[PDB]
Structure formats: structure tokens, C-alpha cells
């Protein structure tokens, strides 16, 4: 054990995950140790509040949900303003 036995480390337990991007995909088990892939549920537990906030809604791009508040304010309308050209 020690320095002599540390030189035999040239393998990989984990690899890149397709759903979360972290290097936490067990190669032999084929399940992610962070997001629970390939299960439909995403891993999440209440005994760690820090972990939940690291991937909660609003920490990414929010491509679609960010424009909803503006659409609700106008009542979800359709059409063009009176005499617009087109």
C-alpha cells in the first residue's frame, strides 16, 4: 500500500454521462451516480439542500419558460396590430 500501489491505477470506473455531463457514469453498472440515468426520475434527495440548488430551475438558459411571464401579461393574444404591413 502507498506509493508503490498507487502506480497500478490506469483504469476508469466512471465516464461521461449523456444527460448531466458529469463524469459519473459507472461503466460496468451503466447507471449514473448523479442524475440516476437511465431511470426516468432524476436523482434528488432532501438530506442535502446544497445539491438540490446546484441544478434547480433557473440555473440554465431557460429557453422557453423565460418568455412566458411577458405573454401572460398581454392575455395570450394572436394577430397583428391593426394596419401593419405584410
Amino acid at each position: 500500500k502507498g506509493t508503490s500501489s498507487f502506480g497500478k491505477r490506469h483504469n476508469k470506473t466512471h465516464g461521461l454521462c449523456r444527460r448531466c455531463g458529469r463524469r459519473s457514469l459507472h461503466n460496468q453498472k451503466k447507471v449514473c451516480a448523479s442524475c440516476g440515468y437511465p431511470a426516468a426520475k432524476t436523482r434528488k434527495y432532501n438530506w442535502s439542500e446544497k445539491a438540490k440548488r446546484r441544478k434547480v430551475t433557473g440555473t440554465g438558459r431557460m429557453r422557453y419558460l423565460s418568455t412566458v411571464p411577458r405573454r401572460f401579461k398581454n392575455g395570450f393574444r394572436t394577430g397583428v396590430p391593426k394596419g401593419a404591413r405584410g
Partner: protein, 122 residues
């Protein structure tokens, strides 16, 4: 050259719109060929030409959508993208006529004994 103003693009037919897109795409590729080892006012033309293609593409698409919507008027089923998109929850509420229906016996009482307008004096 210069911009392709969006003002006059609206008064065109489909064929000549596709034609103008034809020349527009051509020299943009051609001008990128000789951009190497030189840089001047021609660098403003790539940003000029790139946006011009964007305008005509929207005009063709917008004209196609408007004419397509005319076809599907007075039709029970129309494609998914042409259907209004409000919200998943808002698309499953009961329609106004269905949520306003009442039983026959309930309407009978409401016809003869509705809410009255009254006042009591001091």
C-alpha cells in the same frame, strides 16, 4: 452594393423572390473566396449580404404561411403548427358552452324565482 430594403420585398410574387435569393447567395460565397490576405470596406459587405438573405427568407416564409391559413379556413382539423398555442393546461379546460350548461329542473326555478332588485326604508 447595399442593403436589400424590406419595404419593397413585400410587393413581389414567389418566383421572383426565389430568384433574388439565388443571386444573393452567390457572391456571398464568392466574396468569401478572396477575403484571405486582404481586408477593407469589402468586410462590410459580408455583414451586409448575410442580413439581406435573412430578410427575404422571412418574407417567403411569411407569405406561404398566410396563404396556407386561408386554405384551412372552414375545416375541422388543421395541422399542429397552425393551431393556437396557449398553454397545455389552457388547452384542456372545458369550452364556454359546455361549462355553462344547466339541468332542466335548475332552469325552471331560475326562470320564475330569480334574484330580485329591492330596497328597505329606514
Amino acid at each position: 452594393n447595399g442593403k436589400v430594403k424590406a419595404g419593397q420585398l413585400w410587393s413581389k410574387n414567389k418566383e421572383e423572390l426565389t430568384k433574388i435569393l439565388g443571386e444573393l447567395k452567390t457572391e456571398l460565397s464568392q466574396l468569401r473566396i478572396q477575403k484571405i490576405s486582404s481586408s477593407g470596406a469589402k468586410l462590410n459587405k459580408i455583414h451586409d449580404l448575410r442580413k439581406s438573405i435573412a430578410r427575404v427568407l422571412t418574407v417567403i416564409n411569411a407569405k406561404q404561411r398566410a396563404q396556407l391559413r386561408l386554405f384551412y379556413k372552414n375545416k375541422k382539423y388543421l395541422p399542429l403548427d397552425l393551431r393556437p398555442k396557449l398553454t397545455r393546461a389552457l388547452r384542456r379546460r372545458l369550452s364556454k358552452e359546455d361549462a355553462s350548461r344547466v339541468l332542466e329542473k335548475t332552469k325552471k326555478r331560475l326562470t320564475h324565482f330569480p334574484q330580485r332588485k329591492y330596497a328597505v326604508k329606514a
